[PDB]
């Protein structure tokens, strides 16, 4: 028997089988519902579209995200997402497959409890297990120590791990991520004349961000270069023609990660929270943590993020240290790759949560030793 690794994330569902090299199904975690009336009788159209299909009918639908910041807000359409994942993308019956799911650190407990209640009662899986995303990222990166920065689409967190022991008092979590960057880009394009307001235009803006944004190595010098030259402008083609050109906005958007005061937050940049999570750790392991700074998740994919972050952490740390930023090319799938590795271990097959275990101990069994 084989296990399923579902990295539901927040903004992309990645699913597959444990033991594969990459996720088999990758689609947005979106539920769309039609907002117009519908005139053609016999169309027989359905009430809610899920996943990658809802992006084709994006112009007719109003798109919801069932996961806001790691946390699941809408539970019915989350069951819809899972049903679509199991039956339409993977085509497997979950009554004979153990399921491994991921979650961010420092989340509500009811999230896990309802997740397992659903996975055991609605889908009847024989076993299940909820894992932390940063640990799986380290598994896939091949380290056993190192401080991992896992910037997804809802949540950013640091989890320092040494020799296989995680130091929970030094775990940082930040609610600035890819969706906040999309909203800042929507708000910042307005000053150039373009307006994107619909939930269907938020997807176009996300595409613009992915394909054109980048992190500046020196923010003030890049601002001066844009204010003087024009060698920064690039053009993008909207779905209906209507080419748009952006300059400053290319690097002003992901700079919010290093200056969260752009979107009105009080916290410090990802470089400074990484440094602070290191300084919370014991003095003996800071060498290895500095030397093993692992990036993962989609929001770490901007060109220049690693060089910028190395420059910052180097200017923060003492001069004797070797700062290294580990940023693989298959970065944004590291959580899933590590999850597959983990569920594929023979040593792991006694750490699942069984059906009868749950039936006898209630959903509270998720927080206990069967973690």
């Amino acid at each position: 028997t084989t296990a399923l690794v579902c990295d539901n994330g927040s903004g992309l569902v990645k699913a597959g089988f444990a033991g594969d090299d990459a996720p088999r199904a990758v689609f947005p975690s979106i539920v769309g519902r039609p907002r117009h009336q519908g005139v053609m009788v016999g169309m027989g159209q359905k009430d809610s579209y899920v996943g990658d299909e809802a992006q084709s009918k994006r112009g007719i639908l109003t798109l919801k995200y069932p996961i806001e910041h790691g946390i699941i807000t809408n539970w019915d359409d989350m069951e819809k997402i899972w049903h679509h994942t199991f039956y339409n993308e993977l085509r497997v019956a979950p009554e004979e497959h153990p399921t491994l799911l991921t979650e961010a650190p420092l989340n509500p407990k009811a999230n896990r409890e309802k997740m397992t209640q659903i996975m055991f009662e609605t889908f009847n899986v024989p076993a299940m297990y909820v894992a932390i995303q940063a640990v799986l990222s380290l598994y896939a990166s091949g380290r056993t120590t190192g401080i991992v920065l896992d910037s997804g689409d809802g949540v950013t967190h640091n989890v320092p791990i040494y020799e296989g022991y995680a130091l929970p008092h030094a775990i940082m979590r930040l609610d600035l991520a890819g969706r906040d960057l999309t909203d800042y880009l929507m708000k910042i394009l307005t000053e150039r004349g373009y307006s994107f307001v619909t939930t269907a235009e938020r997807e176009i803006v996300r595409d613009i961000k992915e394909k054109l944004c980048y992190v500046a190595l020196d923010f003030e010098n890049e601002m001066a270069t844009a204010a003087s030259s024009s060698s920064l402008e690039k053009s993008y083609e909207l779905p209906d023609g209507q080419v748009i050109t952006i300059g400053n906005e290319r690097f002003r958007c992901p700079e919010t990660l290093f200056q969260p005061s752009f979107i009105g937050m009080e916290s410090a940049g990802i470089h400074e929270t990484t440094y602070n999570s290191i300084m919370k750790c014991d003095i003996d392991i800071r060498k290895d943590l500095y030397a093993n700074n692992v990036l993962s998740g989609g929001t770490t994919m901007y060109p220049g993020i690693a060089d910028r972050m190395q420059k910052e952490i180097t200017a923060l740390a003492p001069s004797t240290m070797k700062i290294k930023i580990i940023a693989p090319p298959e970065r944004k799938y590291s959580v899933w790759i590590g999850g597959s590795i983990l569920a594929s271990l023979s040593t792991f097959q006694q750490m699942w949560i069984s059906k009868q275990e749950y039936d006898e101990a209630g959903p509270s069994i998720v927080h206990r030793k069967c973690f």
């Binding site: 990645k14 089988f17 033991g19 990459a22 990758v26 380290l138 056993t144 580990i326 090319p329």
Partner: protein, 530 residues
């Protein structure tokens, strides 16, 4: 006779016992009364086939060079007599080349599990012969011990008696030059390797396949040889592998029928499929080296299996083929003082075989008892040995722990040993401490088998068990300009057991092959020759 066995010590001089008169005159005498000889069990297998309408299996068990070849030869002679042996012996030097290598106990040891199926018709008359290869060890193509060599073929090619092969393959005469081979015994007084090269070339030219095809075979082996000298370095301020030496890359590509830059890119930057897109995977030096080794082992084993298919096609006769009687040639329960991973695999295979025979003899004794009307002692004779099998194949067994360890991030041999001990020591029955006697080299743990207590060594198992096949380079091979595209024709939702390219282990492939070999044997009534 020794019960259900047939034991045969080889005589070193000619005897009249192999004259056709005893062959013809045995017809009509029974097994229970006639004195022991392999003609007896041959006829008994034949008549068993004819009465039960089933296949039979002859399991000749001995060391290469102790008479196994000629024993099987006289078997096939007797079978022809009671009604294509020349073709078998004629194509044999090919297998002798491509599947034999020098070990310490023997200089012409067989590594693959040769097995000849002799079919028949409805009238029990000679119809055709089939052949299958099993359990061919791939680790030899890359790693060789301190006291042993690689396969014979590389040395036979290294015989300068064919200078056209060397000057067309860029093979310098010096055997120390090539790293895949130089770690083993360079040259030994085994045989006249030049003459053996000639005998194999003769067998090739008299076999169905053309001269271009032998040329491609030789050049492919030379390409496998050229894989070993590749050199990779880490990048400037990153963890990525990049090639510094490009000359052997260029020449290996020019041989293989690919582009050099393209093959280097396919090794340094694999591309994997994530849903509907492709993203590039990163590699370091260790990963790219493991991939190169797995690619070489794969292409060699592929060419070998296809050569066996060609041999069988040459042998193939259109006569209808009914029930067969197979004869099996397998490695032995080898013991040494520095047993290793390969010897563990061999002993695991022989464990499955011995347990199979033991259960067979159990059912035979139950048959004797149910005939005699005296039925007692209803315990089987197999589980007492299966208990040792459960320490290799079963989850949390040695093979599963090894797979998990070569999957884990920073695993080392000491950690492997610690996990073996923590998970088996005392809690098991057969796993136990090593023993240090007469100042033996080293031993990390000891298993007990049917053939005695064996002490195994850990060092190197993690590194040698990895088999990460590189899918982009496999696609390159599929797009070659050679015969290579046939060997690599195609190799690597709704319920998919597709294990990844990285989650591949020699031990797992070996367990699968052993499973299917057992499934082929367990359908035939067996017979055993010692």
């Amino acid at each position: 006779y020794s019960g259900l066995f047939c034991v045969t010590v080889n005589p070193y001089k000619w005897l009249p016992v192999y004259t056709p008169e005893v062959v013809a005159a045995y017809r009509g005498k029974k097994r229970s009364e006639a004195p022991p000889h392999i003609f007896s069990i041959s006829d008994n297998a034949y008549q068993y086939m004819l009465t039960d309408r089933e296949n039979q299996s002859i399991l000749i068990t001995g060391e290469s060079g102790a008479g196994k070849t000629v024993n099987t030869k006289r078997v096939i002679q007797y079978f022809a007599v009671i009604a294509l042996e020349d073709q078998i012996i004629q194509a044999n030097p090919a297998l002798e080349a491509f599947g034999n290598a020098k070990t310490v106990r023997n200089d012409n040891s067989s590594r693959f599990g040769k097995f000849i199926r002799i079919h028949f018709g409805a009238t029990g008359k000679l119809a055709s012969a089939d052949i299958e290869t099993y359990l061919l060890e791939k680790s030899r193509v890359i790693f060789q011990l301190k006291a042993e060599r690689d396969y014979h073929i590389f040395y036979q090619i290294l015989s300068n008696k064919k200078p056209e092969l060397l000057d067309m393959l860029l093979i310098t005469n010096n055997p120390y030059d090539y790293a895949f081979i130089s770690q083993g015994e360079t040259t030994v007084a085994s045989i006249d390797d030049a003459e053996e090269l000639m005998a194999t070339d003769n067998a090739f030219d008299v076999l169905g396949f053309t001269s271009e095809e032998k040329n491609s075979m030789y050049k492919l082996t030379g390409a496998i040889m050229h894989f070993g000298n590749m050199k990779f370095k880490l990048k400037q301020r990153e963890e990525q592998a990049e090639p510094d030496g490009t000359e052997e890359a260029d020449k290996s590509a020019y041989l293989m029928g690919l582009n050099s830059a393209d093959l280097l890119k396919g090794l340094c930057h694999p591309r994997v499929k994530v849903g509907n897109e492709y993203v590039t995977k990163g590699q370091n030096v260790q990963q790219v080296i493991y991939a190169t080794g797995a690619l070489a082992k794969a292409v060699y084993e592929r060419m070998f299996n296809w050569m066996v298919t060609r041999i069988n096609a040459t042998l193939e006769t259109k006569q209808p083929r009914q029930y067969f009687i197979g004869v099996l040639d397998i490695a032995g329960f080898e013991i040494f003082d520095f047993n290793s991973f390969e010897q563990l695999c061999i002993n695991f295979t022989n464990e499955k075989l011995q347990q199979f025979f033991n259960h067979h003899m159990f059912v035979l004794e139950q048959e004797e008892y149910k005939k005699e009307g005296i039925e007692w002692t209803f315990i089987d004779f197999g589980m007492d040995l299966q208990a040792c099998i459960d320490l290799i194949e079963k989850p949390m067994g040695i093979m599963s722990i090894l797979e998990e360890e070569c999957m884990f991030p920073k695993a080392t041999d000491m950690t492997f040993k610690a996990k073996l001990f923590d998970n088996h020591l005392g809690k098991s029955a057969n796993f136990q401490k090593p023993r240090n006697i007469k100042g033996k080299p080293e031993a990390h743990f000891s298993l007990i088998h049917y053939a005695g207590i064996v002490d195994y060594n850990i060092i190197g198992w993690l590194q040698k068990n990895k088999d990460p096949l590189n899918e982009t380079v496999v696609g390159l091979y599929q797009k070659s300009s050679l015969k290579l595209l046939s060997t690599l024709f195609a190799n690597y939702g709704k319920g998919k057991a597709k294990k990844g390219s990285s989650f591949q282990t020699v031990s797992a492939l070996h367990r699968e092959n052993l499973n299917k070999l057992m499934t082929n044997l367990r359908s035939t009534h067996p017979h055993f020759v010692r």
